[PDB]
Amino acid sequence: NLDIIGKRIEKIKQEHETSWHYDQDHPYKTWAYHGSYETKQASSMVNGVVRLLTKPWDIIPMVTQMAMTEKVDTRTQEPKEGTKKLMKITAEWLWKELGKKKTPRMCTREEFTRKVRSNAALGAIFKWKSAREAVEDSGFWELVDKERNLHLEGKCETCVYNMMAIWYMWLGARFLEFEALGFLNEDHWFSRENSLSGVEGEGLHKLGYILRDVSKKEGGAMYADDTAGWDTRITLEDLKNEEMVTNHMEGEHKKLAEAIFKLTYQNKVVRVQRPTTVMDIISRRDQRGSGQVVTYGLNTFTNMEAQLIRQMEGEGVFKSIQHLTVTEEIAVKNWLVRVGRERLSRMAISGDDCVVKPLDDRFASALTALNDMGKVRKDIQQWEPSRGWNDWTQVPFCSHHFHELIMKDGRVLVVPCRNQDELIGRARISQGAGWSLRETACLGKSYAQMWSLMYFHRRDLRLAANAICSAVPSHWVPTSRTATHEWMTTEDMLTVWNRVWIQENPWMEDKTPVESWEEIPYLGKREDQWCGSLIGLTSRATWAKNIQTAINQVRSLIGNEEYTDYMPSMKRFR
């Protein structure tokens, strides 16, 4: 406890000795409170380029409301000795499997610096006002070694979280986390090839094909249960099992990673703004509070573990979570060695998001381990059996569903989809300040090229994407201040479409290139409507007919630049 968090608490208390006070009206019941001190200190801005080219959606509240505008302070009971054993055995088998074809290794100042000099979201907090300033100041790199040497010495002074669910930290604490645990993401530990259940690096154009491949397996319904507040249900045992990745390390690396887990993850210090505006200094040992990138890989690991145990429960590998007989301990082991790899292949897991095709439907009511691990399902009663999906094209995953779409030439595309109001509403929103008109235009172009590559099958989005690309100067480079983003390019979008959907698509045997957009199909007209199309409305007809007037409005605002007309790529403007 304070033998681990005190130096951080002491350092903060002194920097605010003038305002230090043990407030008696602290609202915390699960988070340990330490003290308070004095301070005084983020809306979604509209993208004008996208909004002027999507006029019909100006009167659709599901779009327009997206731009406008309790669980962390809860506890998670300790699992039962049978649960804690199932988790330990499974977590041991899983780190060994993930480690068979990979080597844990430290990530480098050079690698960190290259990532900061390319605008990667490292959940950092404002000596220097930009990350680039710190990584360009041998004084910034002088602070790390002190704490780095403190970590090698098993102590921590400056690794404190700022709650804003994103727990930000000083760039130096982020570096130390990246050096020790960045290898999980940088070396693709959760790739489907290495993890079997994972989809890290896959891309939205691959996820539907992956779910269709899971659907091919013999077995029961496809289950896609969401957890209620996954990051808040992470137990101190879960952290212990995640920490076992250090059993595969050596030297400096082993000690640097052991310190991240012990000092930052299993014993956190957090700063939180309370309007009553003060700063509260609180501590808790459980729950997830690491960096987003590390959070993703450890959530994927612990979710893979939890779903294999739910599969074992459905198959009768054990009978009760109270106590695991030494015999069962050997049955659980022999199950993992004999069929563990096959079982991981029956799943698609992206952090807290899973799809599972179990051996049969006993899985639906196999709930004792899942509830006792604290991974309580959302929107269902605790012993109410799960609702499965009978058709892979109906399963939700990574905020999408997937359509099977047949090209006029017979070839099969499996495409990503979601309600079109969500897509249009998100493209109309920008985050941050000081956006020039050029920077706003280039963010609109990023959305447009994403729509051309992923959502070409939606009539409204192919038309709006063509309009935005016509309205923004042809050589201006797509930008985003904040999968695999193949749309982030100035290459011709037909050439990129061919590369992604034909040349590099391992599910497409015939590699004949597509010569024009007119060849590339849409959903059926009624399916497009079901998924939120405005086709058939008078507002949409007037927009499509008059689109050149909308394009010319935006071109007149941007000014006298070089533009290309992409509308004749469509059938109706040709």
Ligand SMILES: O=C(c1c(F)cccc1F)N1CCCCCC1
């Ligand atoms: O009015 C329609 C229409 C229709 F006639 C039948 C079914 C669904 C529809 F949306 N369409 C005009 C808008 C552009 C492309 C879709 C066709």
Ligand SMILES: [Cl-]
């Ligand atoms: Cl279904």
Ligand SMILES: [Zn+2]
């Ligand atoms: Zn530290």
Ligand SMILES: [Zn+2]
């Ligand atoms: Zn759809």
